[PDB]
Amino acid sequence: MKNAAQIVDEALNQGITLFVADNRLQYETSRDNIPEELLNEWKYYRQDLIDFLQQLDAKEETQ
């Protein structure tokens, strides 16, 4: 039981942010490369993430 917010907090600690674009999960980091484990972990909860990530960006939507 780990909500999107906690998943993003854990990633942020490593200098990597989770955002949404093109209706998919994306990541933004300052590292020279993102380790596979990080991707794999974020890939496991991508839909959990996206659900909250959409709102985190508060872009053009059906208001």
From TrEMBL:
In Swiss-Prot or TrEMBL terms, this protein is called Nonribosomal peptide synthetase StoA
